[PDB]
Amino acid sequence: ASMGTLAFDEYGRPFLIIKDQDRKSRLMGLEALKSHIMAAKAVANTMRTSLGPNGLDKMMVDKDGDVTVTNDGATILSMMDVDHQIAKLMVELSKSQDDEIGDGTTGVVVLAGALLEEAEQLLDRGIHPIRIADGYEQAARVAIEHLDKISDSVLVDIKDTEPLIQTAKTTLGSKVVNSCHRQMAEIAVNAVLTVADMERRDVDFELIKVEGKVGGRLEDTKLIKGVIVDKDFSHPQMPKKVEDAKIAILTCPFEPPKPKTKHKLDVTSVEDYKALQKYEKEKFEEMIQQIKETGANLAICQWGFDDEANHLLLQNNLPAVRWVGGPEIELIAIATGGRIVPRFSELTAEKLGFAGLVQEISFGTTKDKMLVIEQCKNSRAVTIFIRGGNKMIIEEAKRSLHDALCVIRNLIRDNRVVYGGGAAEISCALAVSQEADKCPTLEQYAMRAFADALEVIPMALSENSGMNPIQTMTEVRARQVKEMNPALGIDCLHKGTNDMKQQHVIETLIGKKQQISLATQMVRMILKIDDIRKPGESEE
Amino acid sequence: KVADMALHYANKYNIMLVRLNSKWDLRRLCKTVGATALPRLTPPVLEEMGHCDSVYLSEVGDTQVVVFKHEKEDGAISTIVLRGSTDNLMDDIERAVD
Amino acid sequence: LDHGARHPDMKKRVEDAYILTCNVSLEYEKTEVNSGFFYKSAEEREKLVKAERKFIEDRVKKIIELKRKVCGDSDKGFVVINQKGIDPFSLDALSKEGIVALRRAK
Amino acid sequence: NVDNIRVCKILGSGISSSSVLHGMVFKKETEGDVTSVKDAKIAVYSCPF
Amino acid sequence: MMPTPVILLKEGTDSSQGIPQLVSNISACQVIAEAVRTTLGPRGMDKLIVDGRGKATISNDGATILKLLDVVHPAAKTLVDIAKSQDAEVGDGTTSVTLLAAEFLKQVKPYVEEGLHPQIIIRAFRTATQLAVNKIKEIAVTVKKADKVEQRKLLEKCAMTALSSKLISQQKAFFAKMVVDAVMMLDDLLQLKMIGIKKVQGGALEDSQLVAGVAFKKTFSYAGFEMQPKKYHNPKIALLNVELELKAEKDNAEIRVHTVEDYQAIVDAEWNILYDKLEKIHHSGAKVVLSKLPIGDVATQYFADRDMFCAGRVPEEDLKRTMMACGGSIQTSVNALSADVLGRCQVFEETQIGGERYNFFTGCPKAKTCTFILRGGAEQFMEETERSLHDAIMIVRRAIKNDSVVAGGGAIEMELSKYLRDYSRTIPGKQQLLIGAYAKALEIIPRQLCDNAGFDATNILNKLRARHAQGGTWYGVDINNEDIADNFEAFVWEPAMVRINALTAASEAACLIVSVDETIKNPRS
């Protein structure tokens, strides 16, 4: 079932067709489909345990031994050292779901695995894979239409943020940061709403600075409506706090000027040396005086400066910070309302940013200092500053907060929502089953397989919470059929009710639609592959 | 080579630029058009100016080609455009032409 | 001789020929003492470029003057056999005067 | 002169589609924006432009 | 064989001569064709090839699959070469050429075994190919009406037929409409470089869009870029090829001064040069600035202070498309930035596209270009979508050049086989067997369609042959209905030149393969 072809001619002469054909392997027909389905099922079964509030974490170790405890499906599949091509396709699917939506990176894998398992059963029954793909495509179209039908709109206004808080809480429920559940939800919602364009435009994520520092507590994570900089004041005797600071953002080092072109200044006499020394001294004095003339209280530079400028800044009651990065310079300019000035000659009072409070912050017995710029007037840049007991929970909080920010961004893009907990999956499966009855017989099997694959999410949620999967899912489906209510799901938290509208389990509609679409096209692409040609070289 | 400023100013004055890397092709083009390969950027005199019925950019198959075409059935150099479905077949046809 | 004229426009056959056997380099030569050029504008660069070939052009002009003096008609011809190389500029200058020249002779 | 006959090999359309062109063909593009001239006045420079 | 004390060729030279090597060559061609058989028709499948580096590629196109195969057999490489030739000249049918050539070789293999002279086979192939090409030219359906609506319908149907074999076949109508709209905006040469194709990961296939303008990814913005507005309602675009940075005036430039005043003057002169370029750009009236060369942080902040947009290191092709869409001119110098050298678009915007930032130029009324933005869940997914769209674009371009169409699904080849059999019935007989074998080999494509679709090939072929003999030119395989149907009324339309080139290339390859009697392999250096 490998080696391609091997005949060596009917006449005994050599028969070489493909380079290194004796070391290459190939798979054809239904065997390749079975192998692909097996690999995808293995990946999906590994991922399905990390679904829902009761989902468990995966401890991932890289080449160098670094350990990242995480629940994000995209991260889990990205850090795996997979070799099967179908596994790489699953990883690409998760990365795509993360890129487009940012949430639901684990549901796509489970859905694709269930779809491919049902396709395996259908193929064993003897249906062409293209027919299965077409049936899956039309069932996905029906499910997307039903999701559009049963969707609900929410307010994305700043005055009332309760639906946004509920959606962020639903997103963060499965992560480890649920110990500060509402706090993280609120800070994520406020961060997204602060840096946003009102007319349903995009939200630029690079205006949000997510930085974490060890120590403290997870509850100490806070939203800072300004900029947090790893740098500190240049002179150790400079004051550690500036009130009502008038910032002066500069991108020129406080050093004597230097032309870019290859230059040589010739000193030919003692008078030339005296003039050069006087020029250097006067350049330092005049740059300090030019900074002071604008009335600024703080000076922020990007390229650093030397000792004379440092002591002149200290002597002139001008706290200063050096070696600030370009992104940090841009963030400070955006938040404080000031303009980036390329040289002292162009510095004016109108270009000065305003910060209510600039402070240097210590972090215990660490000698580490970080600068805080906050209390801006109308800051259009925000910073999320995360604390924790170890770096691993800090990284996990970073990715969980990123998921929450992405979810609120999706809500801003489109405010229609559907109720999670498997209720949407159950309703879509019911709609697909109803549509299958009217469909001719041949595609009916594909529709029923798609519905069964859709039903895997409620069963996974119920099993992860310890309940019996089949009984719970059947009871919820029966309740959904008996009374018109697409909001009945799997009570993972055992709150006593199956109505997810009351439990406030809310998901973005576009997230579900993207999940279904991406799963459908990846399943079609996998089903359409009937041949593999691996090198088979077992290279080192 | 062609400088960026020279290219920009030639585009400003609606001048077509062709860059022949091999000196053999340059000499053959000079023969087939009737021009002299100047060694400086001096404007050409009347005698050194080359003339051709039509110069244009065209695509044959999937290859972009520049064609120096004479309407008359005469000239110093004539070219044969060989088509085919295989490189080896065209090589054999070229050997037959030789 | 195992080599011919290096200019495409050069004459291929001369009926009556005057032979000029020379061992003078008619190509560009660099100063032995590492000159280098210094200028401040494009026009100055053009002037320096034009003036850097004056030395070779002087000898080429001497050859041209000898050619024009020896035969004022088009009947005769000069074949210039040079043991050293000739740059394309001097080759073109000689060809424009109807002089066939050979470079790098044994 | 045998060398005065040039052969350009372009793949795709079968040998029955071959033709004779009174001129030259270069498998290359053009540097500038202008791509076609109807009354060409070619000036050839051996020096870089 | 006796060992000569001094052998003629170098040791290790391999030589195969006679009928056995010809049979081996035919078998090699069959082996190559077998690797692309299942990738034919709407029910075709994809192949996955992994290189030594481990980067897999997934394709339904015959030419790509053959190229990714490291074929070293001298006779087998002819199939790869003719597939590449068909892709170059036509763009579609890279599987049909190989299938037809291999079928020709298989059909004449029994006659090759029994000592038939190969020149006879070559002459028979040439005669049959000429007759088939003439028949295709004669029976190709063209309409002399010269109207836009039915021409557009023909183009859309051809694009759909060329697209109904790939992973995007479900959205084939949508993608065909996009492709036809894209092609109709090209001016006179239909250059492929004027149709941009951007692949953005994440999203449904239906999320793919065609922009009537130009779009390209954000290119390493410097500090202060986020302070620039990201939407303009009537911008003027300054397409540039200019380095807007503080730098040495020239690589070989040296400044020599002996006075501090001269030092300050030199520094101020550099700053004044940069600000003079920036001020000329600003006073040109433009609002969006693009350049091939990098644009520094100083220039970025200068443009931010003026509420302007800047983007450096924009690729050559993207600026070419922008110039074609907006109607400007790429300026290497800013000394003369007149109104006629500035581009103009209705709306410029930077938006989030699936985890990436893209600059959109829309509303251009005189645009001669377009940009496809393809969405998918995987890298190879979008690559194969791009390949399928390339095939559709090539078909639409060829149909623009000449709108002569024939019914697909094997109808054209069934008609050609019937005509060739009828012709062969009226010739002395040595050519009759070979021409009949050619006609029989012409039946491979409908048979392969039926085999891939899972039908019973024999019964469908019998029905097709009976229908063609009785009457009806455009009856081919109906994949959905498990039967045969009139493929012209079913809009299975393909340009006639596709089949013409396929037959010509297959015949040339078969003749070249048959015409070889010896294979000599020198030892590798």
Ligand SMILES: Nc1ncnc2c1ncn2[C@@H]1O[C@H](COP(=O)(O)OP(=O)(O)O)[C@@H](O)[C@H]1O
């Ligand atoms: N409070 C809850 N009650 C019931 N189900 C929930 C709750 N919170 C989340 N879920 C479900 O758990 C599933 C997994 O969500 P999560 O693990 O946060 O992200 P992903 O969808 O990427 O796995 C979601 O489909 C959601 O419907």
Ligand SMILES: Nc1ncnc2c1ncn2[C@@H]1O[C@H](COP(=O)(O)OP(=O)(O)O)[C@@H](O)[C@H]1O
């Ligand atoms: N809807 C259809 N019904 C029947 N046959 C079709 C249909 N669409 C395409 N075909 C046939 O499938 C054959 C293969 O086309 P395709 O796979 O798109 O490219 P290639 O010719 O390179 O394999 C064509 O010859 C065409 O006649």
Ligand SMILES: [Mg+2]
């Ligand atoms: Mg989630």
Ligand SMILES: [Mg+2]
């Ligand atoms: Mg095709």
